[PDB]
């Protein structure tokens, strides 16, 4: 995030980090329940990647994080890589996350929910702060 | 070089019609734009959440998808519109 700010540790409990086996963060995701994570289809997640929950500082060794293995990757069949439309993938976890003060789920909207232009919302992540 | 610590940013949602002024016909119905406000999602933020508080609860409105190749803060980022994809999520969870 360019021009963002550091978040209060643990205040976005559904935020997970997708890291490859070498420990490299390549994408974010959100916990929708103990066994499922929603992310973008273009992230190209495989069953060899890891879902890290409860993390705040990726350079810290004292955070009690949860490294969850991925059982199955569900890429939406309507995903169109040419136009990047329907960019969503669901990951079913092999080991269920343990909900706590720093790990919990975000709500899903009803299909008919309206979110008006002008509404101020929030986005989070460990993406580049400067390009 | 992604930051070590989790970052956050508040930003406004845009309408698809207005977003087309920026991205033309690349904007489809299963997409929702946000930003162009001085902040911007960027490489490594992909897959992450765009949440809006509705009736006191944080609700997933978008998934970081694509945007400016330079993460321009005056250009809106494009997110997968969750309302258009939630029926599929619900079906997938109910069948597996």
């Amino acid at each position: 995030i360019v021009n963002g700010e550091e978040a209060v540790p643990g205040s976005w409990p559904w935020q997970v980090s997708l890291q490859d086996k070498t420990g490299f963060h390549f994408c974010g995701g959100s916990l929708i329940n103990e066994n499922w994570v929603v992310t973008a289809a273009h992230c190209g997640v495989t069953t060899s990647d890891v879902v890290v929950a409860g993390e705040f500082d990726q350079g810290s060794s004292s955070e009690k994080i949860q490294k969850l293995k991925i059982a199955k990757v569900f890429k939406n069949s309507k995903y169109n890589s040419l136009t990047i439309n329907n960019d969503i993938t669901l990951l079913k976890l092999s080991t269920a996350a343990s909900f706590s003060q720093t790990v919990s789920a975000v709500c899903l909207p009803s299909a008919s929910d309206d979110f008006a232009a002008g509404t101020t919302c929030v986005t989070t992540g460990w993406g580049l702060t400067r390009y | 070089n992604t930051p070590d610590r989790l970052q956050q940013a508040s930003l406004p949602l845009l309408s698809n019609t207005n977003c087309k002024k920026y991205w033309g016909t690349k904007i489809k119905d299963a997409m929702i734009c946000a930003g162009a406000s001085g902040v911007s999602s960027c490489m490594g933020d992909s897959g992450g959440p765009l949440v809006c508080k509705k009736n006191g609860a944080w609700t997933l409105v978008g998934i970081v998808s694509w945007g400016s190749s330079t993460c321009s803060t005056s250009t809106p980022g494009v997110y997968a519109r969750v309302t258009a994809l939630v029926n599929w999520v619900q079906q997938t969870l109910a069948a597996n």
Binding site: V8, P9, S11, W12, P13, T102 | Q8, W58
Partner: peptide, 10 residues
């Protein structure tokens, strides 16, 4: 869902 135990400060 959607109610953090640790409140975000914006």
């Amino acid at each position: 869902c959607g109610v953090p135990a640790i409140q975000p400060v914006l």
